[PDB]
């Protein structure tokens, strides 16, 4: 099961707020089963991704989630840098890769000027080699799909919504989970038939200003296939002290 | 030290002695299954999965029933306990031998009063108890428990059942009765007698520390006749040559006989019902003989068995069943899968290990990498169609699961169903402009003939056509869909296109390599085929929907030699990969198709494609000749055995898209309920595979090369029959088909079905089940049922999932066209079934030994001082529904106060309003609905009043409070309490209030009754003062002589039992005593 | 005697010539290896209960197939990667059901449980003492 709330839910601090009794919910018990999500850095993924695209193909996109499936991204470097890691410690190329330019790679020659590694590398392309490669212009929804599809994806960019960011060479060559059958968390879905958002807060009372936007713009477009529940619904199905918080 | 039988090594004489056993000479286990080779020295055996230790022995992962259970001790299910004890003086006192004094001892108890209870095995000396044990307390204590077990859940009272389920109750009870009574009698040794009573007899004693503590209990006419007793008379009545054992077996094992018939006490239903089982268990009897003959013919001709043995009678090993309790037990397993991906993965992915460990066949892509080692390009040409290839195929990669599993799918075309990963198929339907999709479309069109998707060959047919759109028009059907529609939507026969059936509608002059395809598809596509397998003769088979004894295969399959051309172009694979590459080689020709490529690229495509066509592997001939052998030398071992439907190749009218599982009668018309297998799109689960894995698979592929088939089948084969539980299988087949009758039956029982029962216990009160009422019914039938055979798998878990009430199974799906093939497997009789409704018969005889009472009871006081027992009341304190002068009240019963000194009134049945006198009759209905407003304006007429109630109970159980005769005494209490204790879910045990017999005279003191029966329930009573010559006031009873037919009757034949009316005691057992040798063989190489 | 129970019930002589056996044979598909493969087909089929109603009656299922079925694959063939998987084929199978905890025998929601339905069920028709 899954359940959103309007709030910035996190497996670290949230069970420690709690949140459940917070919104008004009956979970108080020896209950170890309403495990909660990581959705702090979705949030500032989706802050960063609302700088560049458009507000309408983000939250469409990612309103078609999975989120009870794991996954994840890892960015590449570009070609350039991307062939110097193929150079050195050269035992990690996969197959796909041209058996030219694996048979050029796999020689220990300056490779100052090879007259034909030039042509073989201006003629070679990531897209190829890697088959999920997302885009640098990915027009997300493609994004969530092979998220939703998929144990890894590959990209060649930063600005990415809906799972983490891994590194796939080392620093050099860059710039500056289980289950519990009562997950919950912030940004609701409707990818499965058991994902329910819960009811019984106005939209205009969201604080944080980015899961309100997310709430308005989901629930003013899929208002009659969404799955309300209130508190007393969920307890139903249940069963450094911070201060200027209230 | 060594047996020269089956030619095994041993080490100690002990263990030679202890050896010989398992082939049947005597001398002077553990073990499962012994096996031996004999080319080698490496005997396999096998152990239960409880051994604790696995030392250098296999395993059982079957979970088996136990079948075979002995029982020593004697074989009744009734006691007689004494209720009211006592202790009278008597003239004789022992007996005397020159100095000795052995006193008297009698086979019943000495008491003022003496009556049967039920206690199931309370003499049995059991080796394994079923622990379905039914015990029941004397009447005087509380036998409410035994009513209130299965749906009553919530009721408040404690103590109470609930009157709408006792007919429920009682027959989980009468399920347990029986099935805790499912063993088999032992033979254990006897004593010669010389008894001044019983001269020269023979007498059986029971195995343990001391024997002659229960000959008093077995044999009654033990005893003399020293006194002037109910006992004495009854001894005297007897006849004294029906003792100890009657006939002995001819065949001797030792100076013991091997079986013998026994007087002795016991019950005419529990010798039945033990002679049921032994008959049943007879009957699938099987001969060493037949297992040499079933593995042999299983093994395919690759190595023969041998299993000697010397001749014996007394052995039995229960293997031989019928293939409708095979084909009951498949359908059940089908049923358990209810679209879960997970209970079918384990099954093919194990399959597949098995496949790849016991195959000839290596897989190396370094064959591919050799043949393009040598196909290299010139610089300054950016286009290489051997490195796209390659790069394409991945030869480094050596994962293969794709191409097993596509093999153990064969098997299992009903339950899943294959098909190539829509992630194989070009990127944006592809273009005939690209030498990718070139590639990607040689790879699909060479993997897709493996696949048990009922449409590959219109995918393949449009997987071109998509690429060649643009360059090449087929005709369409309707005005929606295009020739651009992709090939992966089309997964069932309803999206064929009208121009791939019929070729004639494609013109040359207008697609022609299209054409070309859809010919070399219709012509070249493999044709599907058949072999045997298993050996119905023995083992049966579990085939539903083919013949018994057929194995069908996507492709042809021929016989096996390996000096086979390489490259042959009449084998059906082969043949395929080469006419696909001709065509591929006709569509690069001409460069139609590549406007753009500026260098030409003709000669290089044809070198590959020859390359290609022209390459040396083996995978072909190995999935022609030595697959379906494997398969089926695999077949007949598997837990789970092959589920198929018809392979089609192009008949679209005959292609199967439903299978479907029905759970009712034939002649009804229910609630079209259909299982969840009728959800699928395909025909079964959909599964994805891997083109590329097995396209490269299919194209490189050895034996070694010094390979002989005889001696690699030999030695694949010892290890994998040497771990066989096909002989476990089979007994699980058996209970699971007893146990579906037996459901059906009991269900039918007490829910409204059109499956005739015979209805033997209709009286006792109960309600019309509903689907939830009747599964948690059968739920509890059903964990019985495994706790008494000892089993922790699955049995009657699928039937349990919505609306039980059921009466037969079948499977059954549908062609295209709507014609369809319903399968019904015809159920044979049940012998637990058939013993259940034989308890049914005799319980609705005597159902006092149980403790119930049938008819109603009267409320109403009674003072007097006489002793006529209650539950056998005179006729006058009695009324119905015919008497003059009675009212009948319905569920309108209202009552009115009167006013200003009137009496009250209640409304009859009929409208009058009556006043609070007379004799009523109610349902039990009314005061239960409100016994609170009821038993606050009734009590104080009852009690001192005139008021007399009729209470209409049906099923009742009762408890019995015996008071002396000789003092006062008053039932108002427990009336009052049993009055106030019902409620509108539960009614405690009807207290009765009986007299104390007594052999000698009494005074009388008033007694106040306030229930009575309304018919003879005292029934259970079996003696009054026995240790006295009569009975002078009180309830009289002497012996019940009818219950000892054949030792007081003396035109009665020694083995004639009135059965249906009464339990007789002292009946004829018969008594065993065999040997369950284990599975051996001796498996021999074939030349 | 006495066989235990397995599951919670209700409760001159001289060596002769041919007597040799030592080495000199090694199988060719092996032994070791066919025992452990036809042990792991040995293995009986899982038990799929859930949706069937418990002793006291309230519906035991266990209240996602397909991608725990693709990863036990991953994790049997030792790869991160399935290869032959059961979700996200090329089919459409999306009118497919499956038992479920939340579907009771009368074919009704299981959100409160048949044992609770009957027990208030039964309690809104109980009396008392009068005062
Ligand atoms: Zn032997």
Redesign the pocket.
């Known amino acids: 099961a899954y359940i959103a709330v309007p709030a910035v839910v996190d497996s670290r601090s949230s069970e420690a707020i709690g949140l459940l009794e917070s919104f008004g919910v009956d979970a108080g018990s020896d209950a170890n089963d309403v495990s909660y999500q990581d959705h702090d850095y979705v949030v500032d993924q989706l802050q960063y991704m609302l700088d560049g695209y458009e507000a309408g193909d983000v939250i469409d996109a990612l309103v078609y989630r999975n989120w009870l499936h794991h996954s994840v991204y890892c960015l590449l470097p570009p070609k350039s840098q991307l062939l110097e890691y193929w150079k050195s410690n050269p035992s990690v190329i996969p197959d796909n890769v041209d058996r030219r330019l694996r048979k050029r790679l796999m020689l220990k020659k300056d490779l100052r000027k090879d007259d034909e590694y030039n042509q073989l590398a201006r003629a070679f392309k990531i897209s190829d080699v890697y088959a999920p490669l997302i885009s640098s212009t990915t027009s997300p929804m493609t994004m969530i799909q092979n998220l939703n599809q998929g144990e890894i994806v590959y990209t060649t960019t930063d600005r990415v919504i809906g799972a983490r960011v891994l590194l796939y060479a080392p620093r050099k060559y860059y710039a500056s989970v289980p289950h519990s059958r009562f997950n919950v968390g912030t940004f609701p879905s409707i990818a499965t038939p058991k994902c329910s958002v819960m009811s019984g807060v106005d939209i205009e009372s969201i604080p944080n200003e980015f899961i309100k936007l997310f709430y308005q713009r989901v629930k003013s477009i899929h208002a009659n296939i969404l799955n309300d529940i209130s508190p007393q619904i969920v307890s139903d199905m249940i069963n450094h002290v911070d201060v200027y918080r209230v | 030290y060594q047996?020269h039988?089956?030619?095994?090594v041993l080490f100690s004489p002990l263990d030679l002695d202890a050896?010989?056993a398992?082939?049947g000479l005597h001398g002077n286990q553990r073990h499962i299954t012994e096996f031996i080779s004999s080319w080698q020295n490496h005997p396999i055996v096998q152990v239960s999965a409880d051994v604790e230790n696995r030392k250098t022995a296999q395993l059982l992962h079957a979970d088996t029933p136990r079948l075979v259970t002995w029982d020593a001790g004697l074989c009744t299910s009734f006691k007689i306990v004494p209720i009211v004890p006592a202790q009278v003086p008597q003239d004789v006192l022992a007996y005397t031998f020159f100095t000795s004094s052995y006193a008297i001892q009698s086979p019943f108890p000495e008491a003022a009063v003496s009556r049967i209870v039920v206690h199931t095995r309370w003499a049995s000396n059991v080796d394994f108890d079923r622990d379905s044990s039914v015990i029941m307390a004397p009447p005087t204590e509380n036998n409410i428990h035994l009513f209130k077990q299965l749906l009553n859940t919530e009721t408040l009272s404690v103590r109470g059942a609930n009157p709408l389920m006792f007919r429920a109750n009682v027959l989980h009870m009468l399920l347990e009765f029986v099935l805790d009574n499912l063993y088999l009698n032992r033979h254990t040794g006897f004593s010669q007698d010389h008894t001044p009573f019983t001269e020269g007899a023979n007498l059986r004693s029971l195995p343990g520390p001391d024997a002659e503590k229960w000959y008093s209990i077995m044999y009654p006419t033990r005893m003399g006749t020293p006194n002037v007793s109910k006992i004495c008379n009854f001894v005297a009545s007897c006849v004294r040559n029906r003792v100890g054992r009657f006939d002995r077996a001819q065949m001797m094992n030792g100076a013991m006989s091997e079986w013998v018939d026994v007087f002795e006490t016991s019950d005419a239903l529990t010798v039945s019902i033990r002679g049921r089982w032994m008959a049943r268990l007879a009957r699938m009897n099987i001969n060493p003989t037949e297992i040499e003959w079933a593995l042999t013919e299983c093994a395919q001709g690759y190595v023969t068995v041998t299993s000697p043995y010397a001749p014996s009678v007394n052995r039995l090993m229960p293997y031989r069943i019928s293939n409708a309790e095979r084909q009951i037990s498949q359908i059940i397993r089908v049923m358990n899968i209810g679209n879960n991906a997970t209970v079918i993965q384990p099954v093919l992915q194990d399959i597949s290990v098995l496949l790849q460990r016991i195959s000839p066949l290596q897989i190396d892509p370094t064959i591919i990498s050799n043949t393009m080692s040598t196909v290299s390009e010139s610089t300054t040409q950016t286009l290489s169609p051997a490195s796209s290839i390659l790069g394409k195929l991945r030869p480094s990669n050596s994962d293969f699961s794709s191409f097993r599993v596509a093999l153990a799918g064969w098997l299992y075309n009903g339950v899943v169903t294959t098909v190539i990963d829509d992630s194989s198929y070009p990127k944006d339907g592809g273009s005939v402009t690209s030498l990718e999709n070139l590639w990607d479309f040689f790879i699909l069109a060479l993997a897709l003939p493996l696949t048990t998707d009922p449409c590959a060959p219109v995918k393949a047919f449009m997987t071109l056509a998509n690429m060649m759109v643009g360059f090449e028009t087929i005709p369409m059907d309707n005005q929606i869909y295009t020739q651009s529609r992709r090939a992966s939507a089309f997964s069932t026969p309803h999206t064929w296109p009208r121009c791939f059936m019929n070729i004639q509608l494609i013109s040359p002059i207008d697609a022609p390599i299209l054409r070309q395809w859809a010919e070399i598809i219709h012509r070249y596509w493999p044709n599907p085929s058949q072999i045997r397998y298993g050996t119905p003769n023995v083992f049966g088979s579990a085939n539903l929907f083919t013949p018994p004894e057929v194995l069908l295969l996507p492709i042809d399959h021929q016989p096996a030699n390996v000096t086979t051309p390489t490259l042959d172009f009449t084998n059906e694979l082969t043949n395929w990969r080469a006419r696909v590459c001709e065509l591929m080689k006709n569509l690069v020709d001409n460069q139609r198709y590549q406007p753009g490529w500026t260098q030409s690229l003709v000669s290089s495509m044809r070198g590959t494609l020859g390359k290609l066509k022209l390459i040396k592997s083996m995978t072909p001939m190995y999935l022609q000749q030595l697959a379906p052998v494997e398969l089926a030398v695999i077949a007949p071992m598997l837990p789970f055995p092959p589920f198929q439907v018809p392979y089609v190749r192009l008949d679209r009218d005959r292609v199967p898209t439903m299978v479907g599982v029905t759970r009712q009668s034939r002649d009804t018309i229910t609630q079209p309920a259909l299982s969840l297998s009728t959800t699928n799109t395909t025909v079964g689960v959909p599964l994805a595979l891997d083109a590329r894995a097995i396209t490269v698979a299919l194209l490189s592929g050895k034996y070694p090369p010094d390979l002989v088939t005889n001696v690699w089948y030999a030695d694949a084969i010892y290890p994998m029959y040497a771990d066989t539980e096909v002989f476990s299988n089979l007994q699980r087949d058996v209970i699971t088909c007893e146990a579906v009758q037996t459901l059906v039956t009991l269900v039918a029982q007490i829910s409204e079905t059109q499956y005739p029962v015979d209805r033997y216990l209709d009286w006792i009160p109960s309600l019309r089940a509903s689907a939830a009422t009747a599964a948690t019914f059968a739920e509890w039938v059903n964990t019985s049922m495994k706790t008494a055979f000892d089993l922790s798998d699955m049995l009657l878990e699928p039937l349990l999932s919505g609306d039980p009430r059921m009466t037969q199974l079948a499977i059954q799906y549908q062609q295209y066209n709507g014609r369809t093939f319903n399968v019904i497997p015809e159920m044979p009789g049940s012998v637990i079934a058939d013993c259940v409704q034989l308890t049914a018969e005799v319980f609705n005889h005597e159902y006092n030994l149980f403790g119930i009472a049938r008819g109603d009871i009267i409320i109403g006081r009674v003072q007097s001082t006489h002793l006529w027992s209650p539950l056998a009341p005179p006729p006058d304190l009695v009324f119905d529904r015919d008497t003059p002068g009675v009212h009948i009240f319905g569920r309108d019963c209202r009552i009115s106060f009167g006013m200003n000194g009137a009496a009250p009134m209640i409304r009859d049945e009929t409208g009058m309003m009556v006043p609070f006198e007379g004799n009523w009759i109610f349902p039990l209905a009314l005061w239960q609905m409100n016994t609170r407003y009821f038993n606050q304006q009734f009590d104080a007429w009852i009690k001192t009043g005139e008021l007399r109630i009729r209470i209409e109970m049906g099923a009742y159980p009762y408890m019995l409070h015996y008071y002396d005769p000789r003092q006062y005494a008053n039932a108002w209490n427990l009336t009052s309490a049993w009055l106030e204790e019902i409620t509108p879910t539960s009614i405690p045990s009807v207290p009765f209030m009986v007299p104390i017999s007594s052999d000698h005279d009494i005074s009388s003191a008033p007694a106040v009754q306030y229930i009575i029966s309304t018919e003879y329930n005292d029934r259970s009573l079996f003696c009054t003062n026995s240790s006295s010559p009569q009975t002078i006031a009180g309830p009289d009873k002497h012996i019940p002589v009818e219950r000892y037919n054949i030792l007081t009757n003396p035109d009665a034949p020694p083995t004639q039992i009135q059965l249906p009316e009464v339990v007789d005691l002292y009946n004829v057992v018969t008594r065993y005593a065999y040997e369950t040798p284990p599975i051996?063989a001796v498996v021999m190489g074939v030349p | 005697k006495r066989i235990p129970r397995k599951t919670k019930g209700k409760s001159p002589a001289t060596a002769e010539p041919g007597t040799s056996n030592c080495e000199h044979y090694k199988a060719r598909p092996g032994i070791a290896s066919v025992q452990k493969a036809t042990e792991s087909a040995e293995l009986p089929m899982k038990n799929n209960d859930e949706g069937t109603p418990d002793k006291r009656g309230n519906t035991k299922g266990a209240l996602d197939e397909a991608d725990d079925a693709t990863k036990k694959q991953a994790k049997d063939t030792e790869k991160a990667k399935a290869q032959v998987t059961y979700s996200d084929t090329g089919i459409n199978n999306a009118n497919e059901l499956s038992r479920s905890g939340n579907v009771d025998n009368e074919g009704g929601s299981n959100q409160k449980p048949m044992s609770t339905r009957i027990a208030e069920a039964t309690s809104a028709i109980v009396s008392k003492h009068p005062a």
């Not at chain 2, 039988?5 to 095994?8: D, E, F, Q, T």
């Open positions: 047996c039988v089956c030619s095994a050896h010989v398992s082939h051996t």
